Symmetry: D3
Subunit: 237 residues, 6 copies
């Protein structure tokens, strides 16, 4: 193959993990997958396919923003027979009780983008994740002794929004974390009949800017990828 993915049917697994930063795709491939092979290099957006406890899995970065992940998720769904897409990354929190490094599952994703209105006759489309995929992630987290919060995410189109008051609105309606893809990926999944989920670890807090050692961020990132990988094995059962 496609404009952004130079590969053929079969190169990708039916389950693709999608980190924001491409650099992270390689890290995932060599750290959690076995017998990994490179399946895409276009635009430096490296893609890998391999196995995790016998389960075939693919990993590749989806880029920053809704327009970006919309391209990749769509091509994967429609051209490589991808059934599930798990986005793994970070988010900013707005609720006082949502601490840093907390794991958040996007059962739903609010947004200020127009993609879904363009798709849904300018009405309100509830960009949601696949339920089974949400519960798998939650059960997997539980098994790893991790606490996982489930609820709405907010997919911002502007990391630097002109409306600083929107953060208060998000806080008032329970938004768990602010990121930039969920709403988009959920839109594509519904459009092409596939299943999607977004998992985020809280990076910063719009509140008091705390601090996390590079070691801690590393630990939390591996925890999230484990949740994702284990949730897939749960979904297969």
């Amino acid at each position: 193959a496609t404009p952004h993915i130079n590969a053929e049917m079969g190169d990708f697994a039916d389950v693709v993990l999608m980190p924001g930063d491409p650099l992270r795709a390689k890290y995932i491939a060599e750290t959690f997958l076995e017998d990994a092979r490179e399946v895409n290099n276009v635009r430096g957006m490296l893609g890998f396919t391999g196995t995790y406890k016998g389960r075939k899995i693919s990993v590749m970065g989806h880029g920053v923003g809704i327009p970006s992940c919309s391209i990749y998720t769509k091509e994967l769904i429609t051209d490589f027979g991808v059934k599930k897409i798990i986005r793994v990354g970070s988010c900013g929190a707005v609720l006082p009780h949502v601490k840093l490094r907390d794991v958040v599952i996007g059962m739903g994703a609010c947004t200020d983008s127009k993609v879904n209105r363009i798709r849904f006759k300018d009405h309100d489309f509830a960009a949601i994740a696949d339920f089974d995929m949400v519960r798998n992630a939650v059960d997997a987290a539980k098994a790893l002794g991790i606490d996982a919060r489930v609820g709405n995410l907010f997919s911002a189109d502007l990391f630097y929004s002109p409306d600083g008051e929107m953060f208060d609105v998000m806080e008032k309606y329970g938004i768990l974390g602010v990121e930039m893809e969920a709403a988009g990926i959920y839109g594509v999944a519904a459009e092409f009949g596939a299943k999607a989920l977004t998992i985020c670890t809280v990076s910063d807090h719009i509140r008091t800017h705390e601090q996390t050692t590079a070691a801690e961020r590393q630990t939390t990132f591996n925890d999230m990828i484990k949740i994702a990988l284990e949730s897939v094995l749960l979904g297969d059962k």
Copy 2:
């Protein structure tokens, strides 16, 4: 007491099941609740409180439409300490594979209404259910050997829409059932910090054209009610 509810703090359980039809409320109370007392009759919107296997439960109609159910769920949450509201109604299908008598659970709900937009600064609020309630519900239907699909519902403002092109859209983006309140109820729950879930049985198929009616229809409807009642018992454990 409040404008639309002639009761006092205590008259309701902390969990309220809400069908659209007040007459259906009475039916629920006399069929599944023991020692059900009538706690409200204002505007004919019958409310009842009783016990289901020892747990205090209430059931009350919320009328038809987001504007209607918004008033009641809100007054329940803010004046009668209700912590959970489970809407138990019917819906029409648009997807071919969704058959009559199918039990649908609205993890999320799309909509025609402009209510959440008024709440979310004209942005996209993903009206979603409470995850634990969705899961409790799924597990209960499972214990009763009932197949329940989880996904998106569509909350229409107009039961007689002037544009039927919207149905192809709902179908394309996978909406499981068409009703008229979920989006409103999930908006209220988020706005006032409560938890809500909407469970529906398909009573019509806007596709093959067919409105269910038989001992079978009534059997499935009661299953939905038992899934709702049983889900609170699970939420308790």
Copy 3:
């Protein structure tokens, strides 16, 4: 028989008075109509057909909100030959010089609902009543010695609006009363080819906070009814 009305062409007169409260429909039929006969109880939305000074009149509640009265007004207009709908309901005042028990005639109706935008390719549709019906009502009022302000009403989707600033805007633009149906009825009448008028009794003040009290509500409630009924006779002449 339609989906929400178990009646047959003929059970309803060509004009129907419609309060939001089903119990009011009943009260009206008992207090002002002769030979009152119940013609509908589906969903407890009581309907009646009687005689007023010899004229065949019908009265039936329509429920709370645009979605609700849209269903009932539509069904009446298309399956029961109803030519005129007169909504006789309650509203909230926002102007200082408007006090409880005041009777307002909605020559027009503003709204925050999306129904009409949906019907009008997203442009501005001026939800307006039928001129002769407004004139009849104004004339019926003078003949009764009752005062009645004619002007704009505001049909709200959220009785509990999270946007309090909007009331200031309504005030500045002279909204006489805040209710929840007008714009919808006027929307339906235009779409289905019938005529409608909304008469409302100020049951409370949005600024001062005063609900219906004393025995005053009754006669003023009856004033609205008297006006609606007489205006029907003036229209016949």
Copy 4:
């Protein structure tokens, strides 16, 4: 003197007839007004003040489009004590049963402009005329033997609309005439606290394509004027 009117408080009567065409203002002042005096020629937007059967009347063009008549109606209302504005203009018919020379009274006015949405927090404002003025006009018409339809007008921003399908929507909703000011005037009157009414003569048919012809345009043009003028007298009584 305001930015667009070189006059002084007093040069204008408390009611002003306003055609879109400055040359019509002139014709009206010469044909129907006694002691006509020019009170404005800024931007060639001719204004006059005379006497009609003893009543001080004023007539001034307002130009084409909402932005234009918004400026003039505003300036008149805030700096020249004008209490009533009667727009006497031309419109296009869209309904089959509406033919050239027909006189329509805009009880309300739909529009595709954004002015009112701007004034009304993006909600629906029902641009409506002053009831008594509409009633006066209807009465003045019967006394003249002239026919006049009362109802909705549609104020268009684009005389040459690229959206032809919209005319079908207008037709379905009974728009009596398509013009370019009503919604604006009604918008201004409400905002600045004055009263307005629009009377229009069907100068052409949007479906059949027929513009003003023969000597008929004149008397029918004069019919509208006669009605507007008389209605002013009825209002005085």
Copy 5:
């Protein structure tokens, strides 16, 4: 001839300069054109054709507002073979560094209007001028030793806006001048394949509050006119 222009193919040049004021049109013609004949007077919108240094030029007012100038520019392009339209008006500044008597060229134009949205499927159409005309204009002002700023204009629907918060916005995003037609004219030009440019002199500063008036103001206004006339001579070479 067309509804608003009483002329015949040929009466105009292929280039029309358009001030908002018809009286200003006459002023242009008698001041800069040789042997100017009047080619239109319908509705008082004076149009003139003459020659500037041997090149055939026309000048005509377009009235005030997008709805007004849209009608005229359109009829000029589609019925009188006009290929270029140069609006020459005034504008108010919002930016501190923009002083009175400053010549502004609208490379682009923002707007309040809903016209382009009707044209562009509710999306964002960037109303822009014709590049060559902008450059011709810049070069001409340069040859005349005049400093001309190029940028965005704001086309307001309401000269008396109900929200002054919009001015801080225009200023923040760098809008150079506030007028009422450019966006409309650029929309028409694109819709009918013509070329348009809007040149403005700052006659008011909504900031320091100051409306220019002196021999100086009139001197700058004539410069703008010469920049416009001279720009066509350049476009020819």
Copy 6:
């Protein structure tokens, strides 16, 4: 430094060239810049600073989509004192007369994103480039014997849009090319007072899918970078 740029004030030039694909930043640095140095590697988004004919210049990829380039352009403007941003990439054409490999300058950029409406109080912001930067690019192109088309670009948020009819609308309003950043970058520039320009070479054509050798695409890409680099030197004069 910033969340996405790990560098300090001074590391970047006041002029930054921004290709879509990061891989292209390195190619530009080693092919057209001298004494280049790496200034950013975060997320693999490589940035370089160096000189072109003595002129200090920086190059770095901005990623795919408005949300992405919005982040980088903003941080560069506000944290590294960047004055000008030139985006260099490709686009799809919709006009029959726009051939492949044609150079297009985005004087303006239409879009279906909501970023500018969020910024401009939901009104129409004309996302435009800096004029001088546009003319420099055009003159530079001319000097290289290259033909450059100037006009509107369309910044799509969905590379795979559900509305296939939008391409016809774009064609009707002269859109020169379809890409995905312009509107966004122009928005940020206006918000933070900097200058921006977008240059694109036509890659595909929504019409007949022609073909271009890798050699030809290489030649055209170098031509575009030369235009950009030379336009900067022209802007300095």
